[PDB]
Ligand binder design. Structure first.
Ligand SMILES: COc1ccc([C@H]2OC[C@H](C)[C@@H]([C@@H](C)[C@@H](OC)[C@@H](C)/C=C/C(=O)[C@H](C)[C@@H](C/C=C/N(C)C=O)OC)O2)cc1
Ligand SMILES: Nc1ncnc2c1ncn2[C@@H]1O[C@H](COP(=O)(O)OP(=O)(O)O)[C@@H](O)[C@H]1O
Ligand SMILES: [Ca+2]
Length: 360
């Protein structure tokens, strides 16, 4: 029977059937409760006023299992409209996901949803498979968290994994702030959803930050107009490139951590010397926050400036990197040499949660 692929994202839940072109269902990772006892996804925030909203998978890691259970329950019956007892289910997890976490991910799958078989894959790793690589370093920047994950011979290197608590969610908020400072007023939650659309449609990464700031202070060639739903037309200037700039300079929002370019460098320099030249030549971009135009040219420039001059440096930004993680799981599930890595109902009834250390 057709396997299931569910990418448990920090902001969006990508779910669908293994072997498909794209995930059939994409919805918010939010659980709302004060007509019913709970809501999940779009309608959870449509009625955000009467409910209490929950981000159980924010920052990449699942923290609440009652809410998560509601998200998975929403995925199976309401979105994909399948019987979880009739489908092997591949789950995804954030890098550096603790052991007891994937144990509990597995327990809930069998004891509560009764899956025939399941598996938990690291998100960044799947994105690499989707590119056609078993070796390389992935920059996974989603909604709630950004990870740098070096992968060698098809296996991620935990000690060199970098975690940056800065992603598109922080950027959206940042874009509201600086747009409000200019003279507008985007404060409400409904206005947040509007600003996020501006971010995805008009923002871009500046090749050189200061030079772009100068073109903005002296001309209006960088300015773009944006029509609000109520017909009102607003104008965005340097906020276009100042927004994603936070990924390289987290200090703009008080975050005293290294940028995505530096965390990439630091990640590689934690790996064994012999494979570093391979990581440099295979920098894969993953997640929606890496969708900014010009982010690859900026990454190319900054990594080069940090690395030896003799170093060959390549940046890979796939056009479908919004759904890289899910696609990677779709091919993994359909892979013949992977079938023996499933954890079956029988296997779990015999061993317990202790078996996920043997397969995952
Ligand atoms: C969607 O477009 C495409 C994407 C990729 C490819 C294809 O390109 C050539 C690649 C050698 C190939 C590889 C990378 C993929 O196979 C389809 C990928 C699924 C293979 C992964 C593995 O072999 C690993 C090492 C093993 C074990 C898994 C370890 N794990 C999950 C650790 O976390 O899985 C059987 O993938 C072809 C088309
Ligand atoms: N074209 C785009 N430009 C910039 N950001 C985008 C674009 N498309 C989506 N995003 C951002 O990507 C984030 C979604 O990332 P995602 O891959 O779902 O990560 P996660 O699975 O952790 O939520 C959202 O915060 C969204 O604002
Ligand atoms: Ca993700």
């Amino acid at each position: 029977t057709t396997a299931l692929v569910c990418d448990n994202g920090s902001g969006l839940v990508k779910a669908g059937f293994a072997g498909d072109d794209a995930p059939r269902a994409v919805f918010p990772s939010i659980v709302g409760r004060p007509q019913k006892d709970s809501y999940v996804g779009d309608e959870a925030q449509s009625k955000r006023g009467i409910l209490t909203l929950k981000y159980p998978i924010e920052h990449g890691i699942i923290t609440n299992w009652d809410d998560m259970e509601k998200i998975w329950h929403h995925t199976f019956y309401n979105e994909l409209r399948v019987a979880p007892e009739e489908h092997p289910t591949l789950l995804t997890e954030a890098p550096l996901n603790p052991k007891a976490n994937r144990e509990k991910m597995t327990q809930i799958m069998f004891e509560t949803f009764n899956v025939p078989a399941m598996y938990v894959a690291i998100q960044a790793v799947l994105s690499l498979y989707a590119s056609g690589r078993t070796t390389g370093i992935v920059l996974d920047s989603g909604d709630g968290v950004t990870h740098n994950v070096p992968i060698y011979e098809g296996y991620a290197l935990p000690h060199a994994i970098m975690r940056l608590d800065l992603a598109g969610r922080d950027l959206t908020d940042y874009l509201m702030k600086i747009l409000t400072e200019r003279g507008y007023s985007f404060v409400t939650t409904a206005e947040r959803e509007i600003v996020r659309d501006i971010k995805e449609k008009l923002c871009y990464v500046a090749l050189d930050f200061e030079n772009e700031m100068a073109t903005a202070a002296s001309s209006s060639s960088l300015e773009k107009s944006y029509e609000l739903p109520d017909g009102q037309v607003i104008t965005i200037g340097n906020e276009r490139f100042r927004c994603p700039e936070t990924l390289f300079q987290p200090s703009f929002i008080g975050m005293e951590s290294a940028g995505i370019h530096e965390t990439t460098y630091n990640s590689i320099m934690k790996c064994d010397i012999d494979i570093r030249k391979d990581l440099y030549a295979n920098n894969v971009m993953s997640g929606g926050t890496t969708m900014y135009p010009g982010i690859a040219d900026r990454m190319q420039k900054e990594i080069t400036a940090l690395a030896p001059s003799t170093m060959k440096i390549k940046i890979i930004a796939p056009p479908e990197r919004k759904y890289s993680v899910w696609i990677g799981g779709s091919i993994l599930a359909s892979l013949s040499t992977f079938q023996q890595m499933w954890i079956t109902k029988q296997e779990y009834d015999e061993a317990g949660p202790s078996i996920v250390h043997r397969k995952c």
